[PDB]
Design a protein around this ligand. Sequence first.
Ligand SMILES: [K+]
Ligand SMILES: [Mg+2]
Lengths: 95, 221, 159, 60, 50, 228
Amino acid sequence: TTRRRKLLGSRYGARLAKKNRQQFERARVILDCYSDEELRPDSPPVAVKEVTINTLQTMRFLFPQTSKEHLDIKQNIASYKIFSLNRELLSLLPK
Amino acid sequence: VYRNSHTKRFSCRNSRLKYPFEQIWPTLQLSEDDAAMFRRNSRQFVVDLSQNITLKNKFALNKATKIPHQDARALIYESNLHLDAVGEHPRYLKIRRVTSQYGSKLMNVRKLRLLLGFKRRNFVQKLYEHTLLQQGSNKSWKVLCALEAKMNLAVTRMGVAEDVLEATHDLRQNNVTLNGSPAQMKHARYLEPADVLAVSAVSLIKQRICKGLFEVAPNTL
Amino acid sequence: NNPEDNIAIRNAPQKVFQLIGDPRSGVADDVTHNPFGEITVEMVWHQLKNEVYWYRYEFAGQTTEQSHRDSRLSDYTKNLIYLLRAKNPRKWTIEALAEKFHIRKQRVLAILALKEMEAHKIESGKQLQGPLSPYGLKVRVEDLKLLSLDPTGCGWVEP
Amino acid sequence: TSVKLFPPVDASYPTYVDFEHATRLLDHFTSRKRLNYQRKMIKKRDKFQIKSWDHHAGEA
Amino acid sequence: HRFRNNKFLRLEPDLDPKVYGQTETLQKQVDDNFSLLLAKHRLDMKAAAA
Amino acid sequence: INMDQYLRMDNQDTLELLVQAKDNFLKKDERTIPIPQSVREVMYRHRWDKVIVDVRRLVYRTKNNKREQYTAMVASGNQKGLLGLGMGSAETAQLAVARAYLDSFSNLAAVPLYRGHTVYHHVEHHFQRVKVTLSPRTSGWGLRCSNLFYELCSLAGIRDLTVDVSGATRNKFFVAKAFFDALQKQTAPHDGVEGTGVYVKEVVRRPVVNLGTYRNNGTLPPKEYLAT
Ligand SMILES: [K+]
Ligand SMILES: [Mg+2]
């Protein structure tokens, strides 16, 4: 007497290609899929422009010192983050 | 077999120790009396020194940090009249006989069954036969590799189960997938250097870890 | 590249050439001992509340040191590998990244796969939501510069 | 999610295991019948072969 | 400084994660900072207008 | 129990214990411990192990009753390249073992080994009414021998070998003695190498098995012999 639905699986790449084709193409270039002759796809490689990372540990876990080296790293990340937000805002501010 | 030997408290038996049993489950909660019984295998009293020493201290006295894996047996179970048994007359020193091998050999096979999750002996025998055919020069290391390649033990290494027994139940419930889908022959196969394991019961496993470490989590965020 | 601050240089292959005899009349290789090591075991921990002992087996324990560092790299280092690969795949090959961070090629490729999966979750909106939203960073590959510790002491310069 | 990388080079267990004593006992119960079947199948890994479907007695 | 222990001049204690939750506590901290900025604009407008 | 004191004792430096233990052992008289002082000093450079070989009981009858006498043999050796056999006689089994164990340290001898794990070549020895054979094996292959020889190999440090013993093996003292003598009949590549005028170089050559083993396993020998 289980209410849990049956689980039929599929490879991660298989699901991604149907949900977001752009991400799938980017992953192939990063994961070095164009170096081996046997596994080389026919489609030409796509250039990588933007990536996303998580900086929670680098900001609040990893750099506790008061030296200029640790302060500079945190400030640069904060400054870059604000620039990204401002670019998004400018795209919407105009009437 | 609703025996006491199939419970964690009495799972492992060793006849060469002062207390015959041995504790191998890192998450078992013992009572005060039980802890006292097990502690007798850790502390020993030296007559000439008039002090208590521990097993770790004994290794330091022998200058043992990294030793050949076959030499650790002589340190755990034997005694020396110049380091740890100084002051005892030679007449009362214990020396083993060639007739004690069978008890030791049977005990070690029982350990392999316990680590794998209370497996049957025929299961271990076939595992040994499998390694005889695989490539490699050191027989001892091939056995070790086979144990690691087992799926249920690998799930335990990930850190999502308290012990191997809990990991086995998770496989029967299909809480972990192999290469994107539930595994086939999950109890009999070996994992390869490029296999990918993922949790499908994400909500269940997250609750398990949070509850375990709730008391050791700081009260300041 | 000094042994004091380079564990990798300490853990390097050894060229063994040992002889017994007289080089002017007759010599023979010294085969009276094994200088290549063997499998070792060590006791690592002892829990005093449950009386549990932990033993660690190492294939090459006698010819390596501090092998535990490889699998415990900081999150900052992993993100750096991910960004370098995206910035210039032509120069930052798997071989180059492995040599730079003193790890194996298999580890380099495995790290990239996990970081790529996490990035998709962040973009899709499954992680870093609510109060932790500000910590999801989108980085353009062009706007990235790697500093070096060229000046002796504290201080990182752009070139 | 986890990924395996290569054959292990280190391992830790919450007890001491004597592998030589374990294998010495297990070397007493080995079956030549089971080993021979495993040897034959190692040479017939490829299904798409003519020589994998000859006439023989038993399973292999 | 008279407020030696209350270095940050807080009016209410921080929420306990073990009782209210980690996510709730983090959101409360963000709301507190915005309130301080809003209160600053509040006083200036009232003073300028009246 | 005080857990804090238990933890303190567990994680402590043992230098003070080592000094006290060494001084006590080296200051004991030669009656209780008849080991020479020179041997005692070396006992702190290695790790030692011991095992009982056999215990025999002899009976002598008289007018009224019988006199029982015990004899024992004990083997001891440091893990790598040291082994010795001792014999002791006493009126009780416990005393006979103790005397034999002490006598073993006075009979320590060196055991030649190739790379410290096997023998240089095939050895066949004939101790009186006993025959022992030793066959070298590749590193990591393991030990194939009886239980008694398995214990003896552990003491000396032998890791890969095949041993076969036949003949009148009722007396285990002879069996152990025959094994000890066989190990001392090996020859090394560096014996009198100065008189050869050549360079004796170690080479890598895989050993072969007989034709029957290949046929049964369905495998092939090295291509250097199959060339046709
Ligand atoms: K069983
Ligand atoms: Mg025979």
